[PDB]
Design a protein around this ligand. Sequence first.
Ligand code: HEM
Ligand code: HEM
Ligand SMILES: CNCCN(C)c1cc(CCc2cc(C)cc(N)n2)cc(C(F)(F)F)c1
Ligand SMILES: CNCCN(C)c1cc(CCc2cc(C)cc(N)n2)cc(C(F)(F)F)c1
Ligand SMILES: C[C@H](O)[C@H](O)[C@H]1CNc2nc(N)[nH]c(=O)c2N1
Ligand SMILES: C[C@H](O)[C@H](O)[C@H]1CNc2nc(N)[nH]c(=O)c2N1
Ligand SMILES: [Zn+2]
Lengths: 407, 411
Amino acid sequence: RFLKVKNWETDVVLTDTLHLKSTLETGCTEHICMGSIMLPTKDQLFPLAKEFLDQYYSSIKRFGSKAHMDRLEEVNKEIESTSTYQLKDTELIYGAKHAWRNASRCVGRIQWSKLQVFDARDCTTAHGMFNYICNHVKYATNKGNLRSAITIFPQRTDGKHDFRVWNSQLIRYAGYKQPDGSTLGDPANVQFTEICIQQGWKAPRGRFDVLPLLLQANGNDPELFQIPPELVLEVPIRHPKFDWFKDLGLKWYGLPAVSNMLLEIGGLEFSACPFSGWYMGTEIGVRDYCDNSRYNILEEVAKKMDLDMRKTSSLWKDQALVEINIAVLYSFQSDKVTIVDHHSATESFIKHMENEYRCRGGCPADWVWIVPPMSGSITPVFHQEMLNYRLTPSFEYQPDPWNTHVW
Amino acid sequence: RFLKVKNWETDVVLTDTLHLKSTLETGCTEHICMGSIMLPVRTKDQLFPLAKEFLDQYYSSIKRFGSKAHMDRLEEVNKEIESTSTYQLKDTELIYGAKHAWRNASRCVGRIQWSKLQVFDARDCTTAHGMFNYICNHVKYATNKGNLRSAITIFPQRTDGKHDFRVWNSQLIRYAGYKQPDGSTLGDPANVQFTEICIQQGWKAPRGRFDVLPLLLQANGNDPELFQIPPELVLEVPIRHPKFDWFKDLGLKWYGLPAVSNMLLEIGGLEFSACPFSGWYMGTEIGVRDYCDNSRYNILEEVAKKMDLDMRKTSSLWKDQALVEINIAVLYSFQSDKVTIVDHHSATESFIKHMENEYRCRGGCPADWVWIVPPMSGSITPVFHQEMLNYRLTPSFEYQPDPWNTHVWKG
Ligand code: HEM
Ligand code: HEM
Ligand SMILES: CNCCN(C)c1cc(CCc2cc(C)cc(N)n2)cc(C(F)(F)F)c1
Ligand SMILES: CNCCN(C)c1cc(CCc2cc(C)cc(N)n2)cc(C(F)(F)F)c1
Ligand SMILES: C[C@H](O)[C@H](O)[C@H]1CNc2nc(N)[nH]c(=O)c2N1
Ligand SMILES: C[C@H](O)[C@H](O)[C@H]1CNc2nc(N)[nH]c(=O)c2N1
Ligand SMILES: [Zn+2]
């Protein structure tokens, strides 16, 4: 019940004691591993609050203090009376940083303690939400010197007054279905893009149109807003060798900002909690650009390189894949926008893992997600055994709002 | 209970019922996933149900379930167990068993070929010399002058655990590794420990970068003995690159026949501790792992220099760039010499089809994503996008500890 993890490249062995604090379930059993599956009350509430306050008060070296006991007491009385409770600013911030710290699929967690937390719990309207989000975007972007941030909207009450950001990311490109039968723009956002139009957006039907925000406040119907274009930092994609690369017409945005997840702290649920950091190059160049059900540009790039696309064994796809990822990195660096390559990032994560094992007794990690989608085994994380388990506070997936929303 | 897997590229959803027949444990719990962990004397008591399950499967496959032939076989095995404490498999059961272990191997991307396996019954073997002869024949047969054929050779099953047949090599053909006094390694760093044993056992090492290791063979629980595979039986491929003429000058070659020889084959509760098996390589095994792992030949740097890449910042992706050209070279060299090999695109695409077919005809296909996804270019292969379910079925191939750690030396 004390578990070891081995790195098969360095022979370093770490002992995991942290998993014994695990609460939630994995989806795996003694008889079946689901490691590759993408998505596997006042009475309920109090022990959750308690579990959280215990780790909060432990973290500040005041476990079993009067102040600790006083807070447990106060929170308990508030639950019994109000059916919920409110987090102190200090607890809110601790919770957000620790939700990030606990995200087993995140390779960038060495940065976890340096998260700018924006308390947006006083927000009451979609306009308010828009304002808070423009401020987030501007702060995180910081003229290209990106800073990690989260903005936290009011917590769920009865599930009928939910705050939700309908976009999956604050900043994404639209996708439309052409009469051609093909797809224009980002195919992953076809359904969302339609909903924008079904709600009144006038799409300029381009290939790289920054989607508008669809914001839902206090359970009400969601509203449309356009992010000030001057706040959306974008990078034209060129190659340091291939002069022709720029004619491909590619560009991407600098700010990865996940906005559809659910933040859980002390049993309290934050359904609207957009957060952002900075890209690892492969996210854009391997997944966004080369995935078959995304921008899927491998073939066109291959042709421009005049590769032998006759047989798979010429590895023409692999060759182009590398150059495309060279270009992304080169373009962001040239425009001074923060980005990290997959080698630096995974090397960072190995140190973080080391630090966590040493200072916390473990680091929950999902190998399937941590190993980059290119060049896997030449990155050190590939040779690193990882233990995956669920800790709270946490970021959780939640259903898309349209399949839920009672208009 | 039914289970759903989704391919996130095609939205093809499949339904697993086969996991219901799963016996062994995974290492995972409701509270922990051990999916990325590499590695997470039987009595009559446990033996007959295992025998019975196997014979029930076999007779179902041949459409003779509940036949007099089926029932008589069960009773025969029952008697043989309770009288002799074990039992012998018919030739037909051994063949079926071996094919199904391969079929059940959740880490093997090459399973589309599982029904075409040449099974060599070496259960009449008694000595290490006999083992060598069988293994020579396996190599000659499987190699087939470059037109590779899958094969497995099966030596006598375990009895009391004190008379085990074992092949001490991890693979039948592998290069020596020698640790030097300065700390550097000559040849394959993965094989240093085994090379040392061989040398200690009396092997005269040539001490080059690509020395084929001798076989170290243990029969009937006796001390192991050394044998040199006839070099004419060892097919090798000099590695060159289709565009880079300096590549040949790196001095690289590799052997054509991948033959795992340290695993344990379990069939109907019987344990076959010596069961070398062989197929043909997927290109990345050599070009990505064998050549480019930091803990193996580790040639990325030398290749990158000769290519004149910007090696100062990793963000030049010089490592990535060199890796591709190396893997291009391996594929080119093998094809040019007409030695069977498959690229990772071709292999993973075939596996997806195999998998889908397995869900339809069998109710599932246990698969270890972590191992199935190739070590370069992950998401441009279709397996990356495929949800998989991992579970353990018998017959199976199992890990066993290295013999030198358990062997009782006779002297
Ligand atoms: C600052 C630099 C950061 C880097 C380099 C980074 C990198 C990554 C990458 C590559 C993934 C895999 C996601 C995918 O492939 O779609 C991921 C997942 C994730 N990250 Fe991070 N991230 C960063 C910041 C953050 C921050 C600031 C938070 C929260 C405050 C966060 C929380 C998460 C969560 C919850 C996931 C899982 C998302 C999912 O399951 O879809 N990350 N990260
Ligand atoms: C015919 C072409 C074949 C191909 C292309 C192939 C491919 C592979 C690859 C790439 C691996 C991962 C190896 C590694 O990364 O260390 C693997 C694993 C495995 N294969 Fe196959 N294989 C083939 C044939 C076979 C045969 C004939 C058998 C048995 C009869 C077999 C049984 C297994 C087993 C048990 C593993 C797991 C090994 C381990 O866990 O270390 N394969 N296969
Ligand atoms: C269910 N929400 C997650 C799914 N989404 C919308 C998502 C999200 C990302 C970004 C993940 C991420 C998040 C952050 C904060 C930083 C960073 N570098 N990367 C990339 C991508 C992808 F794969 F690049 F397309 C998709
Ligand atoms: C502990 N079990 C054996 C581990 N060994 C010695 C082994 C073996 C292989 C060969 C795997 C394989 C086996 C077969 C039958 C076909 C094929 N294409 N590849 C590759 C590799 C590796 F890792 F790719 F180099 C290692
Ligand atoms: C089916 C499989 O789980 C799916 O393709 C996963 C694999 N690993 C991943 N890893 C990351 N970082 N991001 C992803 O979207 C995925 N997708
Ligand atoms: C720790 C991790 O499980 C280990 O590096 C695994 C990853 N996946 C693999 N996949 C294959 N095919 N072969 C391997 O040796 C490994 N090694
Ligand atoms: Zn698992």
